[PDB]
C-alpha cells in the first residue's frame with residue numbers, strides 16, 4: 001500500500017511508545033541523581049536496559065521503507081534519524097573490543113593519581129591535587145614538575161589503547177558508508193534537500209578557516225599585552241620575543257586564561273562590581289533569586305514557569321541527611337515536567353547561573369509541540385548560546401542599578417569598563433585558538449595526513465602557529481599529550497564551542513539593535529523589548545523541524561556564520577590595546593627554547 | 597474538570613485506552629468496540645507483530661505530569677431542546 005502511509009503509521013506507533021519509555025528513564029535518572037543508594041543504581045541500570053532494548057528493537061522495524069520514495073520533507077528527518085545503524089554494523093567481537101577499550105580508557109582517566117618522589121606515603125589525585133597546584137600557586141619549579149609528570153605517566157600508558165580505538169572507529173565509519181570518523185562528526189551540521197539552503201559536510205572546514213583568519217590581529221595584540229604584563233611575575237623565565245610556555249597559564253591544558261585577572265589588571269586601584277552586601281542586607285534566599293529571574297524573563301513577553309516547577313525542583317542542598325552531586329542542571333523529563341537542580345548560596349556567580357539555567361528551561365519549553373525525534377536544538381551550538389545571551393544581558397551595571405539592588409545615585413564611570421572588558425576577554429577570546437588547533441589536529445589524525453612516527457613534529461608546530469605556546473621540555477614518541485583532556489579520553493566532539501562563541505555575539509547584536517539601544521554594545525540590556533522577544537521566539541519554537549540556516553535567518557537575518565559582532569563587542573578594548581603597546585615587540589617567534 | 601486525585605497512580609493508571617488507527621472515518625454519535633487486528637498492507641493479516649496493529653493504545657497517567665497530560669473528565673450533556681413528551685417540566689418558583 002502507499003508506502004508513505006505505512007511509514008507514517010510506524011512513526012505514529014513509535015512516538016507513543018517512546019514517550020512513556022523515555023519518561024520512565026528520565027524519572028529514574030532524576031531520583032538517582034538526588035539520592036545515593038545501591039538499589040537505585042540497580043533500578044537505573046534496569047531502566048536504561050529497557051530503554052536501550054526498546055530503541056534497538058524499534059530500529060529494526062524501520063528498515064522496510066527505502067528513503068528515496070518520500071516526498072514530505074518532515075517525516076524524512078525522523079526516518080533518517082531512526083534508520084541509522086547504531087552499532088549493528090560491526091561484528092560481535094568488534095563490539096566487545098570497542099566497549100572494552102572505551103570502558104578501559106574511561107576508567108584509566110578516572111582513577112589517575114600521582115605520588116611525589118621519595119615520599120611513598122605522599123600521593124595526590126588529579127582533580128584533588130593538581131588542579132589546586134595549577135590554579136592558585138605562584139611557584140615555578142613545582143608547576144614544571146607536575147606538568148612533566150602527569151603527561152609522562154598518562155600519555156605513555158594511554159597511547160597504545162588510543163591507536164586501536166582510532167583503528168576500530170575508522171573501521172566502523174567506513175562500514176557506515178562515510179569517509180572517516182571526522183566526517184561522522186562533521187555530519188551533524190549537514191543539511192541536504194531544500195534548494196537554496198544546502199550545506200555540505202565539507203563546507204564547515206572552509207567556513208571555520210575563513211572565519212578564524214579574521215580575529216588573529218586582535219589575538220595578536222592581546223597576546224602581546226599578556227606577554228608584556230607577565231614580565232612582572234616571571235622576570236627571569238619569559239623570553240623577550242618568544243612564545244609563552246604552556247606551564248605558566250593557570251590550567252593543566254590551557255583552555256582558559258581566567259586565572260590571570262589579578263595579574264594583568266589595567267587599573268587595579270578600583271575594585272570590580274560585586275553586589276553581595278545589598279543581597280545580605282535584605283536577607284536573600286534562593287526563592288528571591290529565582291523569582292527575579294522569572295520577572296526578567298517575563299519582562300520581554302515570554303511565558304512564566306509552570307506551577308509544578310516551584311514544587312518539584314530543589315533549590316538548596318538538604319544537608320547531611322541526603323547526598324547529591326552539586327552541579328547545575330535543567331532537566332527535561334517530558335510531558336510537562338521541567339525541574340532545576342542546583343545547590344544555591346548567595347553569590348553573584350550563582351545569580352548568573354540561575355539565569356543561564358532558566359533560559360535553558362525556556363528553550364526546552366519552547367519546542368514542546370514538535371514530535372519526539374525533533375525535540376532538540378537546531379544544532380549542537382544553539383543551546384548554551386541562548387543560555388548565555390541572557391547572562392550577558394543581566395550582569396551589566398545599568399540593569400543592576402535599575403532593579404533597586406544598587407544605589408540610585410550610583411555613578412558609572414569609564415574606568416571600570418576596561419576592567420570588565422578585559423575580564424570578559426580573558427575567558428572568551430583567549431580560548432578560540434585552543435579549540436581550533438585541537439579540532440584541526442584531531443581531523444588531521446582521523447584523515448591520516450600525519451604519520452604515526454611524526455605526530456609531535458606537527459603537533460608542536462601547530463601550537464606555535466595557532467596558540468603561540470611552546471613546550472618547556474623536549475618530548476619523544478612515548479608521550480601522548482592530547483589524550484589527557486577530558487573530552488579526548490572520552491568520545492566527545494570539540495567544535496561546538498567555536499560555533500557557540502560566534503553565535504552568541506551575533507544574537508546579542510541583533511537583539512540590541514532591534515531593542516533600540518544607544519551606545520556601544522557592552523552597555524546593552526535586552527530588557528523591556530517585545531521587539532527582541534518575538535524575534536527570538538520565532539527561532540525558539542521551531543525546534544529541529546526546519547534547517548538551522550532558516551532558523552538563524554529569522555533572528556540574525558543572514559544564513560551563514562558571521563564574525564563581525566565578536567570584534568564589535570571589543571572595540572574600546574581594541575583601541576586601548578592599540579594605544580598601549582606602541583613601544584613593544586609585535587608577534588611571536590619560534591627561536592627561543594628554554595632547553596636551548 | 598481536573599481529576600488527578602482519583603485517576604492516577606505511581607506505577608500508572610493503565611486503565612484508559614484510546615483508538616489511534618483506522619482505515620475509515622466516523623459518523624456523528626457512533627460507538628465502536630471492534631478489537632479486530634488492523635491491516636496496513638496488502639498481505640493477509642495474522643495477529644500482532646509485523647505491520648498489523650492492535651487498534652487500541654493506552655494512556656500513562658502519573659501524579660507528577662504537567663497540566664496538559666493530566667486527566668479532565670468530560671461529560672457531554674447533549675440535551676437537544678426537542679424531547680417533546682415529558683419535556684417542559686419547569687422548576688416553577690412559587691411564592692407565598
Ligand SMILES: *[C@@H]1O[C@H](CO)[C@@H](O[C@@H]2O[C@H](CO)[C@@H](O[C@@H]3O[C@H](CO)[C@@H](O)[C@H](O)[C@@H]3O)[C@H](O)[C@H]2NC(C)=O)[C@H](O)[C@H]1NC(C)=O
Nearest residue numbers: 004005008009011012070071072073074075076369370371
Ligand atoms: C508532511 O507531512 C505532514 C504529516 O502528514 C503534513 O502535516 C499536516 O499539515 C497540514 C497542513 O499543511 C495539517 O492540516 C491542518 O490540520 C488541522 C488539525 O491539526 C486542521 O484543523 C486544518 O484544517 C488542517 O487540515 C495536518 O494536520 C498535518 N498533519 C499532521 C499529522 O501533522 C505536512 O503538511 C506535510 N508537508 C508538506 C510539505 O506537504
Ligand SMILES: *[C@@H]1O[C@H](CO)[C@@H](O[C@@H]2O[C@H](CO)[C@@H](O[C@@H]3O[C@H](CO)[C@@H](O)[C@H](O)[C@@H]3O)[C@H](O)[C@H]2NC(C)=O)[C@H](O)[C@H]1NC(C)=O
Nearest residue numbers: 291292294295296297298299301302303304305306307308
Ligand atoms: C505570569 O506572570 C505575571 C507576572 O508575575 C502574572 O501576572 C499577574 O497578573 C494578575 C492579574 O493582573 C496580578 O494580580 C492582581 O491583579 C489585580 C487586577 O486584576 C491588581 O489590582 C492587583 O494589584 C494584582 O496585580 C498578579 O499580581 C500578577 N503577578 C503575579 C505575581 O501573579 C501572571 O499571572 C503569570 N501567569 C502565568 C500564566 O504564569
Ligand SMILES: *[C@@H]1O[C@H](CO)[C@@H](O[C@@H]2O[C@H](CO)[C@@H](O)[C@H](O)[C@H]2NC(C)=O)[C@H](O)[C@H]1NC(C)=O
Nearest residue numbers: 060063066083084085086087088089090176177
Ligand atoms: C546497516 O545498514 C545497511 C544499510 O545499507 C544495511 O545494509 C543491507 O545489507 C544487506 C546485506 O548486505 C542487504 O540485504 C540490504 O539490502 C542492505 N540494505 C540497504 C538499504 O542497502 C545493513 O544490513 C545494516 N546492518 C545491520 C542492521 O546489521
Ligand SMILES: *[C@@H]1O[C@H](CO)[C@@H](O[C@@H]2O[C@H](CO)[C@@H](O)[C@H](O)[C@H]2NC(C)=O)[C@H](O)[C@H]1NC(C)=O
Nearest residue numbers: 295296299399401402403404525526527528529
Ligand atoms: C525598563 O524596565 C524597568 C522595569 O522596572 C522600567 O521601570 C519602570 O518604569 C516606569 C516608567 O514610568 C516607572 O514609573 C517605574 O517606577 C519603573 N520601575 C522600576 C524602576 O522598578 C523602565 O522604565 C524600563 N525602561 C524604559 C526606558 O522604559
Ligand SMILES: *[C@@H]1O[C@H](CO)[C@@H](O)[C@H](O)[C@H]1NC(C)=O
Nearest residue numbers: 031034035036037321322323
Ligand atoms: C531520598 O532519600 C531519603 C532518605 O534516604 C528519602 O527520605 C527520600 O524519600 C528519597 N527520595 C526519593 C525521591 O524517594
Ligand SMILES: *[C@@H]1O[C@H](CO)[C@@H](O)[C@H](O)[C@H]1NC(C)=O
Nearest residue numbers: 266267413414415416417418
Ligand atoms: C575615560 O575618558 C577620558 C577622556 O579624556 C580618558 O582620558 C580616559 O583615559 C578614559 N578612561 C579611563 C580609564 O579613565
Ligand SMILES: [Zn+2]
Nearest residue numbers: 356360384387
Ligand atoms: Zn548552560
